[PDB]
Design a protein around this ligand. Structure first.
Ligand SMILES: CCCCCCCCCCCCCCCCCC(=O)OC[C@H](COP(=O)([O-])OCC[N+](C)(C)C)OC(=O)CCCCCCCCCCCCCCCCC
Ligand SMILES: CCCCCCCCCCCCCCCCCC(=O)OC[C@H](COP(=O)([O-])OCC[N+](C)(C)C)OC(=O)CCCCCCCCCCCCCCCCC
Ligand SMILES: CCCCCCCCCCCCCCCCCCCC(=O)O[C@H](COC(=O)CCCCCCCCCCCCCC)COP(=O)(O)OCCN
Ligand SMILES: CCCCCCCCCCCCCCCCCCCC(=O)O[C@H](COC(=O)CCCCCCCCCCCCCC)COP(=O)(O)OCCN
Ligand SMILES: CCCCCCCCCCCCCCCCCCCC(=O)O[C@H](COC(=O)CCCCCCCCCCCCCC)COP(=O)(O)OCCN
Ligand SMILES: CC(C)CCC[C@@H](C)[C@H]1CC[C@H]2[C@@H]3CC=C4C[C@@H](O)CC[C@]4(C)[C@H]3CC[C@]12C
Ligand SMILES: CC(C)CCC[C@@H](C)[C@H]1CC[C@H]2[C@@H]3CC=C4C[C@@H](O)CC[C@]4(C)[C@H]3CC[C@]12C
Ligand SMILES: CC(C)CCC[C@@H](C)[C@H]1CC[C@H]2[C@@H]3CC=C4C[C@@H](O)CC[C@]4(C)[C@H]3CC[C@]12C
Ligand SMILES: CC(C)CCC[C@@H](C)[C@H]1CC[C@H]2[C@@H]3CC=C4C[C@@H](O)CC[C@]4(C)[C@H]3CC[C@]12C
Ligand SMILES: CC(C)CCC[C@@H](C)[C@H]1CC[C@H]2[C@@H]3CC=C4C[C@@H](O)CC[C@]4(C)[C@H]3CC[C@]12C
Ligand SMILES: CC(C)CCC[C@@H](C)[C@H]1CC[C@H]2[C@@H]3CC=C4C[C@@H](O)CC[C@]4(C)[C@H]3CC[C@]12C
Ligand SMILES: CC(C)CCC[C@@H](C)[C@H]1CC[C@H]2[C@@H]3CC=C4C[C@@H](O)CC[C@]4(C)[C@H]3CC[C@]12C
Ligand SMILES: CC(C)CCC[C@@H](C)[C@H]1CC[C@H]2[C@@H]3CC=C4C[C@@H](O)CC[C@]4(C)[C@H]3CC[C@]12C
Ligand SMILES: CC(C)CCC[C@@H](C)[C@H]1CC[C@H]2[C@@H]3CC=C4C[C@@H](O)CC[C@]4(C)[C@H]3CC[C@]12C
Ligand SMILES: CC(C)CCC[C@@H](C)[C@H]1CC[C@H]2[C@@H]3CC=C4C[C@@H](O)CC[C@]4(C)[C@H]3CC[C@]12C
Ligand SMILES: CC(C)CCC[C@@H](C)[C@H]1CC[C@H]2[C@@H]3CC=C4C[C@@H](O)CC[C@]4(C)[C@H]3CC[C@]12C
Ligand SMILES: CC(C)CCC[C@@H](C)[C@H]1CC[C@H]2[C@@H]3CC=C4C[C@@H](O)CC[C@]4(C)[C@H]3CC[C@]12C
Ligand SMILES: CC(C)CCC[C@@H](C)[C@H]1CC[C@H]2[C@@H]3CC=C4C[C@@H](O)CC[C@]4(C)[C@H]3CC[C@]12C
Lengths: 43, 350, 25, 150, 203, 150, 150, 150, 150
């Protein structure tokens, strides 16, 4: 009988978790490579 | 459309107003006539004191010289631009840095020229343009080693991106400094056009015309000046920026060009440049091609002020004030040399 | 010089301004 | 009787008419004004002529207001689902057509004003293009009236 | 463009989900579950009415602030070399704030039509109350969004006017007409909201 | 014996027919107006000759209006879900085909007028390309009529 | 007997066959016209020979129109939901295949005309590439016919 | 009698009135502090005078806190949907109004601190604009006080 | 017996098989045409020898057409849900495998033709890499045929 409650809880909790994971992974992937002091030395 | 109207003033609105206020202080035609009517450099300063310039030249020695006036005008523009840059944010900061790369190119050319001729880099510093100062210490105390200087440029200068056009530091001693400068300028202009396009919106709309005309005029003048030189056509075509409107087959026809008549025939296909080439009589006593291109450049920089929410205002203001300083220096030169006949050659602004 | 069109436009602006101003004020 | 929720769609129709026509008129006036103000420092005598695109954007706003008033006067708590849908559709038609016409008028008026500063002959061409863009909002009003009165 | 990428991804995902959900409901003969009637009806009229009042005030203030910053940045920037801008072009700010004044006026007018029911069954709540909630929501949307757009438009026009005045004093008097025309839109929105809530009665 | 929400789809068909056609016409008119303004500074004599793209975009808007009024007059209280879906399909078809044609006309008219400032011979080629772009919207109108008059 | 929502998918097939084919043809025509205008500045004599891209882009819209008219004629009150799915699939296939073919034709024709402004021998290669980018829309039409006629 | 979830909207209204006002005041404080820091390197004597925009952002935050405290002290176990949604509306009003007013105060103050650094006369103009920007959030608070005590 | 919506997934399989394969082939053709236009200016006599990537993209589109026609010939009214899912899976497999293969073909063909304009020996390497990208669409076709005929 509580299908609505459990469905909404799970749907939005997992959407928030997935969005947080995506944002964190995006920030780390697109993180500045950090060797800008070396880009011009190798290239 | 990008709708810059919504967010431009969040960060750059105050500077937009400030730069427009500064532009309102550029001498008008009446002021240029008043300065032209002078008799001595002292009277030139006297008349100039009534304009926005004010007392910029009161401190300096009574025996004024064209050199002193030119340096003071350069210093004033440098101060204003540095203030704007210091108050600018990321995107406009990058725009203003791109504006300064133009003089940084000439400064690095001077540095390499002196170093290859075994002259102290610290002693070359004073001749560099203020707007392109190499505050980085990696390119100082180089010990007159071209390899060390090339590494310093690559590591601690925004020109590392443009120096990948070359292949190695041996290129510094291999290629002529003019070819190095013009290859650097081609790369810089292409990168600047790409940055403006990526900015898009009113910035791109009002700025891309100026960079396009810069590319076309660079092509035309390089062609017209490399005719009698050892600069081959193949090595010349490498110096045409690809931003201009001549990129499809226009630059190619110029590269194959072997005479000013052929350059004019190439320019005919584009009416805007057709008029400039037609008016460039090039015989004594009438406007030259460079003067016609200066007039067109001033016109474009002025039209840059009909848009509102765009960064092109700052580039246009810098170029217009450069032209104004050149005009005032020219008027002072005419006064000093007593050659009043050519005193009207100054290109008016507003 | 008298320009009837400009005078009409000016008076229309004044009337619109005043009438909207009553409400907005 | 009719559904309790029927009036929702007529209400949203009036709201959509007004809001979207207001968006279009606001954009038209903003773009045209930022063009006129920038131009006038160069050609100060063209301001009154160049005000016209602003008036066209205001006319778009007027069309939206007219259709919204029609809907808000013909809308009752017990209007059939059919009439509520008709008013929703009329509102969407007028509002979005006015939005498109306002965008077009803003773009065209700004560009034409800037050109007229440089080329006085272009005034008539600009007026033609502005009338053509305004006729879009007029079409939207026609369709909205057909739907709302039907 | 990271944040715009996130918004675009959310939009695309949501609307792909909606497309497939609608296809499923239609095709599997489960349309009777997609009860928009039940949604609009069970959803309390108070939600609609109070969202409408909140939007009427908040979006009007949002537009007023948008325009005020858009035009004040330009006013203050221009006035560094011509301080007369600060004294003259305050009228643009005045218009941008009249937008919010209209917002609060319409918030008051809408809120004056609220009243509890003491009913939960839709047949008991009735057409009058349901339509009252819907029309208060619609009037709030109308006034708030029209005021938002009018305020932004007047702010853009006022920044233009201030920049133009910084260079020639005799231009603001002619450019204020554009501000007046942009202001008319907020009045139109107010009139339409009033017409919508003219015959609105909760109770 | 038919749903009372049946008319919703037909009303959306009429609203879309007008709205999307108007958006395409607005894009065409706006882009062509920017092009005409840009090219009029140097070559004023070509403004009227070059106003063609705006006319073509207006014709696109007229296609949209025609189909919208046809749907609006075909609407009825007891409109079967079948006829309502037919009118929705016709409205989407005409509106979005006109939208695509308006985009094409905008791009082609901008490029054509800007080029014809430089290359006089390009006028006829630009007219041919604009004719093709208009033919796209004409196809959309044909399909919309077939769907809306079944 | 049959579900009342089948005509919706049928009209969706028709409107997709028209709209997406029109969008593809519009993109092809717009890109090809931009390229033609760019190239004709220096090489006017090729303005007409460089119109094959636009004709090949309009052929895609003709494919879409064929499928849309077929679907609109096949539509009727009691089409089985399976027939409605068939028509929707045919419409989607023709429309999206034509959209891809229009993208390819636009890019190929733009690059080809720009190159042919400098190298006349590239015209035949451009024509062959355009044929290869048109057979995509042809395949979409074939699949749409196979689905619809069934 | 009343739904067990009726208090959610009131709680969220208090939370919003606090949070959105805090975000707006934080933006105002951050922009004004950036402006003051940029200015101070050359005009140290203007820091205290130029700290006004930060204070007005704090005032926006204070309005938010006041309305949040009112709603939080009005919440009760049997809170009806009517009161709950009235408080939700009040919270939305205060929160969004304070958000926008804080944005405007931050932008105007960042502009005007730097401007007054250059032109001393601009200080009073900056204050004049800032008071309007602040009374926007005040209008939000006024509507909230009307609603939460309706 | 079988659900009335079973054929939806079969028609979607056919439509996807054709549409995604056509999209991949169109991307490959567009990229290869851009490369050919770029190279032909300096090395025109290599256009015919360089048309190969477009042929490979056409082969990918032919894979998609084969699977789409097979599904459209195996699609019947009483199609079990199991067979409908099989056909949808075959269509998606071939379509998206061909899309990836077309992306690979476009990138590799563009790069290889540009390089072969400068290094003649690179032609054979380009052919090898194009075959290695083609076998991806071949594998997609294999899986789609297995699923469809199962
Ligand atoms: C390219 C994308 C990949 C394609 C797939 C996309 C993801 C979709 C899958 C979502 C997960 C759901 C799986 C099934 C869950 C169980 C549901 C259930 O019990 O079903 C009962 C439902 C509803 O009940 P019913 O209809 O079975 O019961 C009878 C009901 N009456 C009497 C009213 C008719 O029906 C089914 O049995 C459905 C079975 C198949 C469902 C498969 C998922 C549907 C969506 C597929 C994708 C749609 C787009 C296709 C084209 C795409 C092309 C790019
Ligand atoms: C991306 C922009 C927006 C457009 C796409 C998304 C639009 C819809 C998104 C909102 C959520 C889904 C809404 C529909 C919910 C289901 C309603 C329902 O079951 O009732 C149907 C109703 C009633 O169903 P019913 O089972 O009661 O049938 C009537 C039976 N009698 C008469 C006996 C009572 O009828 C319809 O079929 C109405 C059509 C709308 C439903 C289909 C939605 C289509 C979604 C887009 C995909 C289109 C397919 C083609 C793709 C190509 C497009 C060009
Ligand atoms: C790269 C490959 C890997 C992929 C990434 C990982 C993804 C893995 C999956 C994670 C997301 C789903 C997690 C589980 C969801 C279900 C949780 C509830 C369990 C459940 O079914 O409970 C039932 C009741 O639930 C109900 O009544 C409601 C159930 C419906 C909930 C639906 C949730 C929506 C989907 C959420 C995720 C969306 C985005 C994920 C990225 C049974 O209980 P009972 O007592 O009835 O027992 C039976 C007697 N009746
Ligand atoms: C495209 C492929 C398919 C995607 C499908 C999945 C759904 C979409 C998910 C995103 C997919 C793309 C990856 C984007 C990652 C997030 C956005 C970029 C990174 C990011 O968030 O960081 C900065 C913002 O700070 C932050 O991290 C703040 C973000 C957190 C705020 C959460 C609140 C929003 C809740 C959502 C509801 C609102 C709906 C509105 C429509 C932005 O960086 P930058 O752009 O400044 O720098 C440039 C580089 N980052
Ligand atoms: C190609 C793109 C796709 C285009 C196709 C259109 C897509 C529109 C998306 C909306 C959903 C489709 C519309 C039709 C489905 C409506 C729901 C039917 C299901 C049903 O039986 O509900 C009835 C109530 O519905 C009703 O009476 C509801 C009537 C209103 C339905 C339409 C509302 C949609 C939302 C519009 C919002 C517009 C916003 C504008 C800014 C039952 O009720 P009953 O009386 O039998 O109850 C008996 C209880 N014992
Ligand atoms: C053209 C715009 C600015 C409006 C100004 C003119 C007004 C007064 C006209 C124009 C169109 C008119 C409407 C056109 C259609 C009908 C249907 C008819 O059976 C009753 C009157 C009614 C509802 C008209 C009311 C008045 C109307 C709105
Ligand atoms: C160009 C001018 C006239 C347009 C601006 C004024 C508009 C808003 C006015 C002028 C006349 C007005 C109409 C006059 C009479 C009626 C009949 C009534 O049953 C419904 C409203 C309706 C149809 C009015 C709607 C609003 C209206 C069209
Ligand atoms: C008045 C000016 C702006 C000219 C533009 C015409 C517009 C505004 C108006 C004026 C007369 C109007 C028509 C008058 C009568 C009717 C009959 C009614 O059953 C449907 C609407 C319809 C068909 C109207 C459509 C819109 C209409 C054509
Ligand atoms: C990540 C974003 C895009 C959201 C994911 C899509 C959502 C809407 C999908 C993903 C999985 C889906 C669920 C999968 C299976 C079932 C079982 C069925 O008996 C009821 C529907 C239900 C519970 C679906 C509801 C919709 C659902 C939750
Ligand atoms: C110049 C004015 C009329 C606007 C331009 C568009 C005109 C020509 C369009 C708009 C709506 C169109 C009408 C819409 C509906 C029908 C019903 C149909 O069974 C016969 C054609 C007829 C009567 C159309 C004739 C043409 C029409 C009047
Ligand atoms: C200029 C464009 C339209 C192309 C020129 C070809 C013309 C003659 C073609 C294109 C589309 C064609 C129409 C498309 C659809 C139908 C419906 C059908 O039941 C009878 C034929 C009919 C009515 C066609 C007649 C001829 C037609 C109008
Ligand atoms: C080149 C010309 C003919 C094209 C422009 C006119 C077009 C829009 C006209 C001319 C003849 C028209 C067709 C004539 C008759 C009918 C029968 C009707 O039951 C459905 C529409 C249909 C099939 C028409 C569709 C539109 C149509 C094709
Ligand atoms: C300029 C070029 C593209 C025009 C050629 C258009 C061709 C491809 C079109 C025009 C009319 C079309 C035909 C119209 C009707 C039918 C009947 C149908 O049961 C099978 C397909 C078939 C036989 C079509 C095949 C394709 C077709 C011949
Ligand atoms: C621009 C021109 C040359 C391209 C071809 C377009 C015309 C001729 C096409 C488009 C739509 C086609 C029609 C589509 C559907 C049918 C129904 C079928 O049972 C008989 C053929 C018939 C009636 C086709 C005849 C040819 C047709 C009218
Ligand atoms: C020959 C090449 C160039 C293809 C061009 C024609 C294509 C597009 C068309 C024209 C006529 C079409 C055929 C007409 C009728 C039928 C019968 C039907 O039950 C299955 C599809 C089938 C067999 C069609 C397949 C596709 C088809 C052959
Ligand atoms: C150049 C392009 C068009 C090639 C297309 C691929 C060809 C070879 C494929 C696509 C679909 C295939 C057909 C699909 C189904 C059948 C029915 C079967 O009982 C005999 C073989 C036959 C008739 C196939 C023959 C080969 C076929 C026509
Ligand atoms: C171009 C070629 C190499 C790609 C396709 C590979 C061939 C060899 C594969 C693809 C799908 C396969 C078919 C899939 C299913 C069956 C049904 C089984 O009961 C007998 C074998 C048979 C009929 C297979 C024969 C071989 C087959 C046709
Ligand atoms: C480049 C293209 C042509 C590659 C496809 C070629 C091969 C793999 C295709 C062409 C025709 C196809 C066959 C055509 C018809 C049938 C009958 C069907 O009941 C089972 C699959 C089967 C037996 C197909 C298997 C795959 C097949 C043999």
């Amino acid at each position: 009988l509580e299908y609505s409650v459990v469905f909404n809880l799970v749907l939005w909790i997992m959407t928030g978790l997935a969005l947080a994971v995506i944002i964190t992974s995006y920030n780390i992937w697109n993180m500045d490579p950090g060797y800008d002091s070396i880009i011009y030395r190798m290239t | 459309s990008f709708f810059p109207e919504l967010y431009f003033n969040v960060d750059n609105g105050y500077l937009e107003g400030l730069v427009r206020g500064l532009k309102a202080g550029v001498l008008s035609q009446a002021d240029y006539l008043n300065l032209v009517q002078c008799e001595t450099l002292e009277d030139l300063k006297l008349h100039l004191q009534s304009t926005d310039y004010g007392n910029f030249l009161a401190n300096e020695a009574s025996p004024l010289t064209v050199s002193v006036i030119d340096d003071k005008l350069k210093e004033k523009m440098v101060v204003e631009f540095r203030h704007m840059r210091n108050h600018a944010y990321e995107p406009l900061a990058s725009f203003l840095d791109f504006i300064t790369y133009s003089y940084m190119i000439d400064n690095v050319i001077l540095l390499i020229t002196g170093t290859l001729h075994q002259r102290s880099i610290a002693e070359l510093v004073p001749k560099c343009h203020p707007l392109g100062s190499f505050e980085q210490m990696e390119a100082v105390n180089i010990a007159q080693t071209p390899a060390e200087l090339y590494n310093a440029i690559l590591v601690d200068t925004p020109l590392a991106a443009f120096f990948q056009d070359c292949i190695s530091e041996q290129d510094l001693d291999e290629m002529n400094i003019e070819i190095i400068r013009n290859t650097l300028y081609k790369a810089y202009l292409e990168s600047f056009y790409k940055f403006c396009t990526l900015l898009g919106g009113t910035t791109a709309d009002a700025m891309c015309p100026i960079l396009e005309f810069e590319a076309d005029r660079r092509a035309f003048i390089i062609t017209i000046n490399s005719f009698g030189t050892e600069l081959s056509k193949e090595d010349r075509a490498k110096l045409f920026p690809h931003c201009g409107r001549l990129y499809p087959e226009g630059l190619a026809q110029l590269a194959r060009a072997d005479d000013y008549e052929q350059v004019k025939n190439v320019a005919d296909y584009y009416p805007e440049y057709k008029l400039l080439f037609e008016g460039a009589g090039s015989n004594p006593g009438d406007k030259t091609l460079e003067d016609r291109f200066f007039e067109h450049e001033v016109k474009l920089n002025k039209l840059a002020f009909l848009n509102q929410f765009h960064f092109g205002v700052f580039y246009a203001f810098v170029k217009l004030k450069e032209q104004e300083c050149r005009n005032i220096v020219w008027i002072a030169e005419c006064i000093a040399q007593r050659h009043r006949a050519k005193i009207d050659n100054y290109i008016p602004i507003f | 010089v008298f320009d009837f069109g400009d005078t009409m436009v000016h008076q229309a602006i004044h009337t619109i301004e005043y009438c909207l101003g009553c409400i907005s004020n | 009787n009719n559904p309790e929720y029927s009036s929702f769609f007529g209400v949203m129709g009036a709201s959509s008419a007004m809001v979207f026509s207001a968006m279009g008129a606001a954009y038209g006036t903003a773009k045209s004004g930022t063009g006129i103000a920038a131009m006038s420092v160069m050609r100060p005598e063209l301001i009154m002529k160049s005000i016209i695109p602003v008036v066209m954007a205001g006319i778009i706003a007027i069309y939206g207001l007219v259709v919204a008033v029609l809907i808000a006067n013909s809308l009752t708590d017990g209007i059939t689902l059919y009439r509520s849908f008709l008013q929703l559709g009329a509102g969407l038609s007028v509002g979005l057509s006015g939005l498109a016409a306002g965008f077009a008028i803003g773009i065209v008026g700004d560009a034409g004003v800037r050109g007229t500063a440089q080329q006085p002959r272009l005034f008539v061409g600009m007026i033609l293009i502005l009338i053509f863009a305004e006729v879009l909002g007029l079409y939207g009003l026609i369709v909205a009236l057909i739907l709302s009165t039907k | 463009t990271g944040l715009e990428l996130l918004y675009l991804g959310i939009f695309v995902a949501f609307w792909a989900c909606m497309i497939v959900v609608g296809i499923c409901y239609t095709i599997f003969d489960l349309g009777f579950r997609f009860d928009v009637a039940w949604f609009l009806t069970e959803t309390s009229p108070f939600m609609w009415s109070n969202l409408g009042i909140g939007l009427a005030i908040s979006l009007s203030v949002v537009g007023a602030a948008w325009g005020i910053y858009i035009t004040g940045s330009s006013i203050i920037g221009g006035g560094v070399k011509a301080p007369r801008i600060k004294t003259k072009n305050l009228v643009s700010i005045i218009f941008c704030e009249a937008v919010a004044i209209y917002g609060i006026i319409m918030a008051i007018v809408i809120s004056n039509m609220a009243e509890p029911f003491s009913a939960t069954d839709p047949k008991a709540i009735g057409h009058r109350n349901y339509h009252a909630g819907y029309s208060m929501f619609g009037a709030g949307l109308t006034v708030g969004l029209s005021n938002l757009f009018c305020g932004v438009c007047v702010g853009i026009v006022g920044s233009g006017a201030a920049l133009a005045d910084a260079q020639n004093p005799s231009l603001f008097v002619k450019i204020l007409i554009v501000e007046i025309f942009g202001s008319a839109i907020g009045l139109f929105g107010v009139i339409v909201a009033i017409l919508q809530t003219s015959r609105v009665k909760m109770g």
